[PDB]
């Protein structure tokens, strides 16, 4: 009864937290790729004397 309610509560909490953590990991991965592209743009800056003359 009280136990059924507590299991229900914990189950909703667990499911929401599961999906939040999935999204958090995806967010981390996208930020990593954005940083990689930013670094390539910095490299292109550094390499501009070779690309343009």
Residue numbers in the entry: 445 to 497
From the paper:
Rab11 family-interacting protein 2 (FIP2) is a 512-residue effector that contains a Rab-binding domain (RBD) at its C-terminus. The effector FIP2 contains an N-terminal C2 domain that binds to phospholipids (residues 15–102; Lindsay & McCaffrey, 2004), a myosin Vb-binding domain and a C-terminal RBD that binds to Rab11. The N-terminus of this modular effector family is variable and consists of domains that include EF-hands, ERM domains, C2 domains and myosin V-binding domains. These effectors regulate membrane trafficking following their recruitment to subcellular compartments by Rab11, Rab14 and Rab25 GTPases.
Here, the crystal structure of an uncomplexed form of FIP2 was determined at 2.3 Å resolution by the ab initio phasing method in ARCIMBOLDO. In contrast to previous crystal structures of complexes, the structure of isolated FIP2 reveals the formation of antiparallel α-helical dimers that are stabilized by polar interactions. Although the segment 439–512 was subjected to crystallization, a minimum of the first seven residues and the last 15 residues are dis­ordered. The polypeptides are of varying lengths depending on the extent of disorder at the N/C-termini. The structure reveals antiparallel α-helices that associate through polar interactions. These include a remarkable stack of arginine residues within a four-helix bundle in the crystal lattice. Since crystal formation required the presence of a small amount of Co2+, data were also collected at the Co2+ absorption edge. Also, FIP2 spontaneously forms dimers in solution at physiological pH.
